Amino acid sequence: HMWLEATTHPGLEDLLLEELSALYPGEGAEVDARKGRVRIPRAWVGEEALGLRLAHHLVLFRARLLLSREDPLGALERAALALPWPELEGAGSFRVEARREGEHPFTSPEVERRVGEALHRAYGVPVDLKRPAVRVRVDVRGEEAFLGVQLTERPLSRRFPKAALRGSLTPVLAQALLRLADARPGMRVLDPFTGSGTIALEAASTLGPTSPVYAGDLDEKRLGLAREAALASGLSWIRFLRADARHLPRFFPEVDRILANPPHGLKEGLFHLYWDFLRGALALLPPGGRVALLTLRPALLKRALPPGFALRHARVVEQGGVYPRVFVLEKL
Numbered sequence: 485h486m487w488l489e490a491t492t493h494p495g496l497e498d499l500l501l502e503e504l505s506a507l508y509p510g511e512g513a514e515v516d517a518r519k520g521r522v523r524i525p526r527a528w529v530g531e532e533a534l535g536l537r538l539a540h541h542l543v544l545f546r547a548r549l550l551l552s553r554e555d556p557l558g559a560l561e562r563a564a565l566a567l568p569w570p571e572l573e574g575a576g577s578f579r580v581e582a583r584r585e586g587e588h589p590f591t592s593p594e595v596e597r598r599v600g601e602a603l604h605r606a607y608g609v610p611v612d613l614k615r616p617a618v619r620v621r622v623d624v625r626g627e628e629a630f631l632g633v634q635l636t637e638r639p640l641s642r643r644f645p646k647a648a649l650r651g652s653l654t655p656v657l658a659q660a661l662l663r664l665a666d667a668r669p670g671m672r673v674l675d676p677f678t679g680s681g682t683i684a685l686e687a688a689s690t691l692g693p694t695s696p697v698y699a700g701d702l703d704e705k706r707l708g709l710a711r712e713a714a715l716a717s718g719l720s721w722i723r724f725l726r727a728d729a730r731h732l733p734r735f736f737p738e739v740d741r742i743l744a745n746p747p748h749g750l751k752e753g754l755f756h757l758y759w760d761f762l763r764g765a766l767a768l769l770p771p772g773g774r775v776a777l778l779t780l781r782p783a784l785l786k787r788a789l790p791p792g793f794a795l796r797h798a799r800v801v802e803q804g805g806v807y808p809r810v811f812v813l814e815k816l
Contacts, residue, residue, distance in 0.1 A: 486546050487514075487523045487630070490539040494520040495801035495810075496660050500538040507532060520802065533635065537659040537690065540639040543621050545632035551624065557590055560622060561602045564631055569607065569620070571633050577612035578603070581619050581634070586626040595622050599631075643689075646713035647680040650706070652804035653745055657778070658686035661743040664797065664812050665776035667691060672739035674768065675699040676729045676761065681710025681722075683743050688719040698736050700727030730757060732764030739768055744777040754781070758788035766792050769815040782809045792816055 488508075492500040497515045501522050505513065514523040520540075529544050536542070546567045552559045572578060580603070582595035599622055600611055619634040641656045642648070661683065667673055669691045675683040675698070684699035691697070699722055701707055707724050714722050727735035729746075742765050746757065765775050775793075779785045782798070789795065797812040 485548065486526055486544065486632075487548065488526045488529050488533060489521055489523045489543045489545055489630070490533075490536060491541045491543075492520050492522075492538050492656060493540075493654075493660075493802050494518050495799055495807075496520065496538060496656070497522055499660055499663055500536075502663075503536055503538050507536070529635065534640060536640060537686075538656055538663075540636075540641050540654075540656060542635040542640070543630075543632055544635055545621070545623075545630040547629075547631045549629055551627055551629045556588065557594060557598045560595060560624075560629060560631070561598050563629070564599050564620075564622070565602055565606060567631060569603065569633065571618045572603070572607045572609050575609065575617040577610050577616050578618045578620055579611055579613055579616035580622060582622040582624070584624045586624070588624060595624070644682060644685045644713055644717065646716055647682045647685055647710060650680045650682075653679075653682055653778075654803075655682060655686050657801070657803060658683045658743070659690065660801070661745075661776040661778065661810065662687055662690060662741075664799075664810055665741045665743060665774045667695075667741040667743070670694045671741055672696045672737075673698070674732075674736055674739040674742045675744075676727070676732060676736075676742060676765070677701065677745050677747065678707075678710060678724065679703070679745075680706045681713050681724070683745060684710065684722050684724070685713055685717065685719055687743065688714070688722050689717065693721050696739075697722045698739060699724050700729060700732070700735055702726065702728060730760035730764070732761070733767050736768060738770060738773075740770070740773055742769070742773075742775040742777075744775060746777070746779060748780060751784070755784055755788060758785055762788055762793070763790055765813075766790055766815055771815055773815045775811075775813040777811050777813070778803075778808050779811070780806065780808050782811070785809075785811065789813070
């Protein structure tokens with residue numbers, strides 16, 4: 485019995501589960517709440533899995549077993565040796581990456597050594613710690629263990645690299661704002677703090693050319709990069725504009741959805757940016773228009789909310805080791 489496991493930011497499991505379920509209908513999906521993991525039982529995984537927009541890494545687990553407390557390292561080594569590893573085919577180097585959750589009398593490096601040396605001996609392929617061609621995964625979680633192979637080399641979230649390195653904001657988080665705001669093809673979308681363009685590009689790539697996409701920032705240099713990135717992926721209909729998010733109506737027309745990732749710092753100055761931005765956002769929506777926004781400062785954000793908005797959803801999401809909130813607001 486085999487399992488595809490997909491990882492995302494903790495807090496986005498329910499959305500990842502929806503994406504997977506549309507790709508692979510059927511029952512038995514498992515979600516690890518607050519851990520960023522979803523698993524689907526699968527007899528086969530092809531290239532279709534690499535089209536996931538909410539996933540960071542994919543692993544195919546070929547075995548799951550109850551770890552025998554008698555000789556747990558021996559049991560893992562025997563489990564690994566009873567599986568097929570055709571990936572070690574043209575690969576010509578590998579490593580084992582082991583992870584543990586719960587208390588165990590062994591460490592992750594012990595698992596890597598015992599499993600890796602058993603595979604090296606059966607397969608002859610050399611271990612390469614820094615640049616492995618294939619990554620074998622062993623995860624021990626409480627009393628169960630999962631063994632298999634990482635399917636992704638680089639994370640799927642490394643799309644749009646010309647817009648990346650800035651900042652902590654991944655295309656996966658951008659896709660989640662899109663979905664939490666219930667944006668659909670044909671809707672007008674604004675990215676009011678666009679930076680090097682990640683949210684705008686994610687939106688354009690997902691919604692296609694029937695959705696007008698507006699994107700603004702004060703930094704002309706970063707707008708130059710965003711335009712370059714849009715062209716490189718065929719997403720040139722995005723309207724990038726030098727624009728102050730404190731005065732959005734000076735620059736943008738009404739839209740249906742606003743996906744907003746305000747800067748972390750410039751606190752009174754921050755409150756004033758939130759104050760002006762949220763009022764501009766309200767003025768650029770119809771009744772029923774929606775904002776999805778990410779913030780490290782939920783109390784301050786809520787203090788700044790104008791009363792024309794209803795707060796419809798809030799959730800916590802892990803990003804770059806810290807925990808911003810996503811709020812969805814609807815204009816009443």
